[PDB]
RNA sequence: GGUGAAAUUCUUGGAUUUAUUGAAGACUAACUACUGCGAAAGCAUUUGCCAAGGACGUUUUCAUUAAUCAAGAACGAAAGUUAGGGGAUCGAAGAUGAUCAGAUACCGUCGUAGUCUUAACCAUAAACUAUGCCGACUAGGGAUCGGGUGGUGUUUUUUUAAUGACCCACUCGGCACCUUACGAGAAAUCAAAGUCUUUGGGUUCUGGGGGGAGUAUGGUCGCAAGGCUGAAACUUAAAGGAAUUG
């Protein structure tokens, strides 16, 4: 069933902390919980071991990533910048 | 333009999926082409390349992960490596790709 | 009523073009609606061309011509005599002179 | 309270030998003081000058040139190329309605590491026997033309040094070879480089400067 | 055979900067403005005070050495009206009639490849 | 513990005598176990490589940067922070960097820093939602929580405290020329009120 | 009157009225 | 500096002005058109990459799979909201100098939110072609955009001997346009607003005098702003359109 309408994972907080704070943390809490892609085996096994650590349940590779995502947007653009810049460096 | 050539084989030709079946065929000498996904571990891909050098067979490197390889072959699981024992009427054996 | 067949502009199949600013009053008018005049104006007016011809150093000099594309909101365009309110039957005319 | 013109000596600028008459213009800074002489603060100037003067002929009335001074000897300043640009009047006159202009630009380093961003301009041309009113291009002629110009400019520059680069830019052979490679593709009216700007200047290597000056 | 300066003349409304420098472009020789000559708060943009500014410019570029000048006319440009004001032609005439020789006239007004927002609001000025 | 950024327990073969020395890096985004961190000036420009700032090209994103060579990391070591290499000066052998506080610092081109942003980004964008999480955050760092306001204290306990009405009383912006025990409030505030306007 | 400012006055009034309504709720 | 006429403002510590630059952000001028694309809102720097798309060509394939469309859904300018970044110009609010009789307005200077971006909202605009969508026909023309066909046509290193652009004549599609209205309309006007008192091609929505009133209330959606839905009491004999004379 639809147990709750829109608080979602932030329903455990009940009525406290204010609905805006609960909404702001809901979008981060779904992210730090959902299983993610694994760049090394292509499985939905990845889970946040710790704040910034993303272990794969299989193949035991852990990646340092964002505290609430396997790879944040600034990290993604840094990896793009490094790839592009090494591309000009090499050729 | 590799997925349709693969689709011809998966319907008509003969094939095996997975590392164990791939090396089994490579040591039997039946395999003529092996396709390795990029997602597969480097150790596996390197030893498969070495087996292919020993067996004088050609290796195709997939332009995608094992998920892409699985979908392209047509099996809804992940396939790291695919071996093509007897291709059908597909021209991939006479094709460099 | 509709005073003009093409409302005030040339916008048939766009919906939005781009605003521009009037060179006089800086009014934000769409570039196709604005009254564009291409000011082909020399540097030195003809009552001083011979004056500078004698005062010059180059025996033959080019007398450079300044070009400037003027965009006018019609509110100042017809205020500054550039274009004029015509009769209803003469509105259909589109001749440059 | 007292005229500071009384303490000037009216120095002179000297163009590279790869042009017409070396005499380009005068200048002035100040007398020679122990704290501040006349040679210490003089260097670093950009002389902006019409190429018509540097070539002694009227055909280059546009196409102005920027020469950057390096040293001083006696009352003479030794300048070196820095970059050219078309005069605004010529640019505006070239651009007219009812044709598409092609602008290209490629940034490369020459034989010596004078990285420069050469530009180029070109206009779609209404050839004779044409009754059409505007003669616009097809946005694929634009793409092809700027591709061929991007490679043509990188053939002319980065294949030589600034000396021969200026000595071949002034005679306008580059634009004619652009027309050579382009006339098969699309008719274009007047291809012009229209700009070059040096970006980085390496070690000062005065030997080449003295060779170009004397 | 004559020494070349650069006039770098900036004629807009509310000003006529007749600012002669040397050909190298850094050292100024009598930056004079029409606001320096007239005590009526709108004669500086008038063709008269443009002629006075160029007149004193010519007077103190003579007996100093400068003989021929590359006049670089310039409008306010930028994001502003970008049309040469009434002081331009009059100042050029003043330089021409003051004996100071003139070479290589051109308009160096700063045109934006695209400007920022123009002052005045969307509806612009309302007079 | 007491640090948002996870650490990479990197091991290096000791060049001089046979053993493996285990160094502790601040992990960047994208480093994973079984990755070959390449440290040195000849190293390639990849994520995780430690590169002297001369090697890196302009506009690159580097982190854990050395202030001076040998300092073993000073700049942009907190989670999600980075330093942008904006200038190279072989004439003075110095590199200009845009720095997380917006500063533009010149540091020696011999200085080195790991390539890529520090892991754990976005950590502070989720509110702690409660004193429990705030307390557990500071329990692993140091005794700086809770933080009583100076107004609520008594005049002995703070410059602000006291009064029949809870109020600072004097100007809160304390001069930098003040002395220990006076620097309670806004210190050397060049400007006050809402930023950006 | 315009179709804009009769509307805006009505909206100022509507905000005051919903404020009073919520206050009385 | 700025203005109708000024002043507030910056300024001998150097203002404004010049040259070298540097930095940042924003925009993509001219080219730019009775031109193009897009479902619309919209889209004007280069290149690369990714997919998408229409038109055309097609002696290709399937065989009615189609048109319209309540419910429901995606997108939806600007402004506005939310958290992060950046933050140059302009600039609500604001402060101010002017004018006026007054002027917390028009004009000037500075200036916050905003203007940009990332991720979420809102879901309205004179979102206009004030002309629903699909289909056929009815009148002519001349341009133009995209595609296609033909010319022993012009034109480019070599003067049919390595090939685009153009010219001519068609044809499909698109934005349109010019004349006449045979026709229609209240007329302005229209080539669709025509094939409607000689009234029936298919189909969805909306309107029933003006105000009150897009209001109250209820509901729902939104963080809010507000959106969507939506009266009535009472009140009035005009409101209104298009042309004519003054």
From Swiss-Prot, chain A:
A single cellular component GO annotation: cytosolic large ribosomal subunit
Origin: domain of life: Eukaryota
One of the protein's GO biological processes: cytoplasmic translation
GO molecular function terms noted in the UniProt entry: structural constituent of ribosome; zinc ion binding
Cleaved signal peptide residues: none
Keyword set includes Zinc-finger: yes
Gene3D superfamilies xref list: 2.20.25.30
UniProt keyword list: Cytoplasm, Metal-binding, Phosphoprotein, Ribonucleoprotein, Ribosomal protein, Zinc, Zinc-finger
Modified residues (Phosphoserine): 39
Protein location: Cytoplasm
TM region(s), chain numbering: none
Zinc finger (C4-type) residue numbers: 38-59
Family: Belongs to the eukaryotic ribosomal protein eL43 family.
Function text: Component of the ribosome, a large ribonucleoprotein complex responsible for the synthesis of proteins in the cell. The small ribosomal subunit (SSU) binds messenger RNAs (mRNAs) and translates the encoded message by selecting cognate aminoacyl-transfer RNA (tRNA) molecules. The large subunit (LSU) contains the ribosomal catalytic site termed the peptidyl transferase center (PTC), which catalyzes the formation of peptide bonds, thereby polymerizing the amino acids delivered by tRNAs into a polypeptide chain.
Miscellaneous: Present with 44600 molecules/cell in log phase SD medium. There are 2 genes for eL43 in yeast.
Protein name: Large ribosomal subunit protein eL43A
Species this protein is from: Saccharomyces cerevisiae (strain ATCC 204508 / S288c) (Baker's yeast)
Gene field: RPL43A
Swiss-Prot record, chain E:
Entry comment on modification after translation: N-terminally acetylated by acetyltransferase NatA.
Annotated source species: Saccharomyces cerevisiae (strain ATCC 204508 / S288c)
Basic residues bias spans: 118-127
Name assigned to this protein: Small ribosomal subunit protein uS11A
Database matches in InterPro entries: Ribosomal_uS11, Ribosomal_uS11_CS, Ribosomal_uS11_sf
Free-text function comment from the UniProt entry: Component of the ribosome, a large ribonucleoprotein complex responsible for the synthesis of proteins in the cell. The small ribosomal subunit (SSU) binds messenger RNAs (mRNAs) and translates the encoded message by selecting cognate aminoacyl-transfer RNA (tRNA) molecules. The large subunit (LSU) contains the ribosomal catalytic site termed the peptidyl transferase center (PTC), which catalyzes the formation of peptide bonds, thereby polymerizing the amino acids delivered by tRNAs into a polypeptide chain.
Keywords: Acetylation, Cytoplasm, Nucleus, Ribonucleoprotein, Ribosomal protein, Ribosome biogenesis, rRNA processing
The UniProt record lists the keyword Ribosomal protein: yes
HAMAP family for this protein: Ribosomal_uS11
Miscellaneous comment: Present with 29600 molecules/cell in log phase SD medium. There are 2 genes for uS11 in yeast.
One GO-annotated biological process of the protein: translation
From Swiss-Prot, chain F:
Keyword flag Membrane: no
Primary localization: cytoplasm
Domain of life assignment: Eukaryota
Alphabetical GO biological process terms: cytoplasmic translation; maintenance of translational fidelity; ribosomal large subunit biogenesis
Cellular component terms (Gene Ontology): cytosol; cytosolic large ribosomal subunit
Molecular function per GO: RNA binding; rRNA binding; structural constituent of ribosome
Keyword set, alphabetical order: Cytoplasm, Isopeptide bond, Phosphoprotein, Ribonucleoprotein, Ribosomal protein, RNA-binding, rRNA-binding, Ubl conjugation
Residues with the Phosphoserine modification: 1, 44, 108-109
Positions bearing the Glycyl lysine isopeptide (Lys-Gly) (interchain with G-Cter in ubiquitin) cross-link: 42, 68, 94
Keyword Ubl conjugation: yes
Subcellular location: Cytoplasm
Function: Component of the ribosome, a large ribonucleoprotein complex responsible for the synthesis of proteins in the cell. The small ribosomal subunit (SSU) binds messenger RNAs (mRNAs) and translates the encoded message by selecting cognate aminoacyl-transfer RNA (tRNA) molecules. The large subunit (LSU) contains the ribosomal catalytic site termed the peptidyl transferase center (PTC), which catalyzes the formation of peptide bonds, thereby polymerizing the amino acids delivered by tRNAs into a polypeptide chain.
Family that this chain belongs to: Belongs to the universal ribosomal protein uL2 family.
Extra remark beyond the main annotation: There are 2 genes for uL2 in yeast.
Name recorded for this polypeptide: Large ribosomal subunit protein uL2A
Full protein: residues contained: 52 to 248 of 254
Curated annotation (Swiss-Prot), chain G:
Disulfide linkage: none
Organism: Saccharomyces cerevisiae (strain ATCC 204508 / S288c)
Gene: RPL41A
Subcellular location(s) of the protein: Cytoplasm
Protein name: Small ribosomal subunit protein eS32A
Record function comment: Component of the ribosome, a large ribonucleoprotein complex responsible for the synthesis of proteins in the cell. The small ribosomal subunit (SSU) binds messenger RNAs (mRNAs) and translates the encoded message by selecting cognate aminoacyl-transfer RNA (tRNA) molecules. The large subunit (LSU) contains the ribosomal catalytic site termed the peptidyl transferase center (PTC), which catalyzes the formation of peptide bonds, thereby polymerizing the amino acids delivered by tRNAs into a polypeptide chain.
GO cellular component term, pick one: cytosolic large ribosomal subunit
Positions of region (Disordered): 1-25
Misc. remarks from the entry: Present with 11900 molecules/cell in log phase SD medium.
Assembly notes: Component of the small ribosomal subunit (SSU). Mature yeast ribosomes consist of a small (40S) and a large (60S) subunit. The 40S small subunit contains 1 molecule of ribosomal RNA (18S rRNA) and 33 different proteins (encoded by 57 genes). The large 60S subunit contains 3 rRNA molecules (25S, 5.8S and 5S rRNA) and 46 different proteins (encoded by 81 genes).
Pfam families: Ribosomal_L41
């Amino acid at each position: 069933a639809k147990r709750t309408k829109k608080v979602g994972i932030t329903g455990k907080y009940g009525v406290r902390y204010g609905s805006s704070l609960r909404r702001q943390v809901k979008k981060l809490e779904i992210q730090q919980h959902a299983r993610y892609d694994c760049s090394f085996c292509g499985k939905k096994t990845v889970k946040r071991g710790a704040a910034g650590i993303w272990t794969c349940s299989c193949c035991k590779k852990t990646v340092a990533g964002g505290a609430y995502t396997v790879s944040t947007a600034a990290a993604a653009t840094v990896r793009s910048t490094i790839r592009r810049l090494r591309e000009m460096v090499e050729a | 333009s590799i997925n349709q050539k693969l689709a011809l084989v998966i319907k008509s030709g003969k094939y095996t999926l997975g590392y164990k079946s791939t090396v089994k065929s490579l040591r039997q000498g039946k395999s003529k082409l092996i396709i390795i996904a990029a997602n597969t571990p480097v150790l596996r891909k390197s030893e498969l390349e070495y087996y292919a050098m020993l067996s004088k067979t050609k290796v195709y490197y997939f332009q995608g992960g094992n998920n892409e390889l699985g979908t392209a072959v047509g099996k809804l699981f992940r396939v790291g490596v695919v071996s093509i024992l007897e291709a059908g009427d597909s021209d991939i054996l006479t094709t460099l790709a | 009523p509709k005073k003009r067949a093409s409302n005030g502009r040339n916008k048939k199949g766009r919906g939005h073009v781009k605003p521009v600013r009037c060179v006089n009053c800086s009014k934000s008018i769409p570039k196709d609606k604005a009254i564009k005049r291409m000011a082909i104006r020399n540097i030195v007016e003809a009552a001083a061309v011979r004056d500078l011809s004698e005062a010059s150093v180059y025996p033959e000099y080019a007398l450079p011509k300044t070009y400037n594309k003027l965009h006018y909101c019609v509110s100042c365009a017809i205020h500054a005599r550039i274009v004029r309110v015509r009769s209803r039957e003469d509105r259909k005319n589109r001749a440059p002179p | 309270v007292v005229d500071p013109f009384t303490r000037k000596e009216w120095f002179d600028i000297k163009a590279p030998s790869t042009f017409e008459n070396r005499n380009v213009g005068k200048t002035l800074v100040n007398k020679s003081t122990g704290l501040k002489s006349a040679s210490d603060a003089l260097k670093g100037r950009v002389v902006e000058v019409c190429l018509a003067d540097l070539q002694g002929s009227e055909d280059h009335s546009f196409r102005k040139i920027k020469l950057r001074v390096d040293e001083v000897q006696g009352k003479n300043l030794l300048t070196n190329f820095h970059g050219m640009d078309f005069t605004t009047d010529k640019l505006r006159s070239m651009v007219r309605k009812w044709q598409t202009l092609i602008e290209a630009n490629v940034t490369v380093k020459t034989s010596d590491d004078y990285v420069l961003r050469i530009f180029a301009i070109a206009f779609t041309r209404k050839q004779a026997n044409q009754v059409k009113r505007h003669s616009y291009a097809q946005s694929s002629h634009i793409r092809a033309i700027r591709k061929v110009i991007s490679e043509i400019l990188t053939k002319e520059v980065q294949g030589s040094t600034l000396a021969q680069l200026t000595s071949k830019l002034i005679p306008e052979v580059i634009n004619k070879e652009i027309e050579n490679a382009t006339k098969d593709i699309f008719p274009l009216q007047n291809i012009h480089v229209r700009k070059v700007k040096l970006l980085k200047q390496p070690k000062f290597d005065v030997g080449a400067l003295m060779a170009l000056h004397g | 055979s004559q020494v070349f300066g650069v006039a770098r003349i900036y004629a807009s409304f509310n000003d006529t900067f007749v600012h002669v420098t040397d050909l190298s472009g850094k050292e100024t020789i009598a930056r004079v403005t029409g606001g320096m000559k007239v005590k009526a708060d709108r004669d500086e943009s008038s063709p008269y005070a443009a002629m006075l500014a160029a007149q004193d410019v010519a007077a103190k570029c003579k007996e100093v050495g400068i003989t021929a000048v590359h006049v670089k006319i310039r409008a306010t440009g930028g994001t502003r009206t970008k049309t040469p004001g009434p002081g331009g032609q009059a100042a050029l005439r003043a330089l021409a009639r003051s004996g100071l020789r003139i070479g290589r006239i051109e308009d160096v007004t700063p045109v934006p490849s695209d400007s920022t927002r123009k002052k005045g609001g969307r509806r612009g000025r309302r007079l | 513990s007491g640090r948002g950024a996870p650490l990479a327990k990197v091991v290096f073969r000791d060049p001089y005598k046979y053993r493996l020395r285990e160094e502790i890096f601040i992990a960047n985004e994208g480093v994973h176990t079984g990755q070959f961190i390449y440290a040195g000036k000849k190293a390639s420009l990849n994520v995780g490589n430690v590169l002297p700032l001369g090697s890196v090209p302009e506009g690159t994103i580097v982190s854990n940067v050395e202030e001076k060579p040998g300092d073993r990391g000073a700049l942009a070591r907190a989670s999600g922070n980075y330093v942008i290499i904006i200038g190279h000066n072989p004439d003075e052998n110095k590199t200009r960097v845009r720095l997380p506080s917006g500063a533009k610092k010149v540091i020696s081109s011999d200085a080195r820093g790991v390539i890529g942003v520090i892991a754990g980004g976005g950590r502070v964008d989720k509110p702690l939602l409660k004193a429990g999480r705030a307390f557990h955050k500071y329990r692993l760092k140091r005794n700086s929580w809770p933080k009583t306001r100076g107004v609520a204290m008594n005049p002995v306990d703070h410059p602000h405290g006291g009064g029949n009405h809870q109020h600072i009383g004097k100007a809160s912006t304390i001069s930098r020329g003040a002395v220990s025990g006076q620097k309670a409030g806004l210190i050397a505030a060049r400007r006050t009120g809402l930023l950006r306007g | 009157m315009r179709a804009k400012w009769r509307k805006k006055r009505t909206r100022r009034l509507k905000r005051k009225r919903r404020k009073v309504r919520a206050r009385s709720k």
